[PDB]
Design a protein around this ligand. Sequence first.
Ligand SMILES: *C(=N)C1(NC(=O)[C@@H]2C[C@@H](S(=O)(=O)c3ccccc3Cl)CN2C(=O)C2(c3ccc(C)cc3)CC2)CC1
Length: 216
Amino acid sequence: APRSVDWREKGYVTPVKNQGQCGSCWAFSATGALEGQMFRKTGRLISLSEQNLVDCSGPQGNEGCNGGLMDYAFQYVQDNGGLDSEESYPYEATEESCKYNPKYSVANDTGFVDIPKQEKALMKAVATVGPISVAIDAGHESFLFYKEGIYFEPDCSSEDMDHGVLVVGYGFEDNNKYWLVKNSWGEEWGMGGYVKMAKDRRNHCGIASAASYPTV
Ligand SMILES: *C(=N)C1(NC(=O)[C@@H]2C[C@@H](S(=O)(=O)c3ccccc3Cl)CN2C(=O)C2(c3ccc(C)cc3)CC2)CC1
């Protein structure tokens, strides 16, 4: 694979968003992934409604501001015939009743792909597909106060993930490789909203344990 990849450069990635005081990280990872694949398809980068996901994907298994899965959001989009743009269906950081307007929809998917549970398979996907939804163990306070550099937490779990985020690329700066990850905690956290997560250090924080992307 290429030694470095950055989808931000190719226009696949919207600016950093802020989930606020609602546990909807899964909705940001999913829109992030769909934004990428839609752009790969249409050449138009259009921001997407996390609120549409939060309010409307209960049937598929999601729990609004209490958590959910990226794949359940991707299944919702396939079930629903589409997803509203962020412009039309704005983010409120609260669970309210559903409001999908089929006319205001700018995206769709034909399903999703679950990537094999290794960093090699993740790298293959990131290099060839675009941005990838991933689960990480973000439970450690080191992650909360992350500012710069390659994030390495010795106590991280490869199997116990609690935060959905988006891999937009990877690179290198011993133990010098990283995944470039877009978070949804706004631009004042980490590196303008991003974190470099240790790569090829035995699936650090579980970054390859539940990686997926939508098919468009
Ligand atoms: C985000 N603000 C928040 N975390 C989650 O919603 C997080 C998102 C997924 S995941 O951690 O990426 C994950 C974990 C295991 C397997 C697949 C995936 Cl995609 C689920 N999340 C969770 O925190 C858990 C969860 C699982 C299912 C449901 C319905 C709700 C939560 C606890 C695993 C909310 C803090």
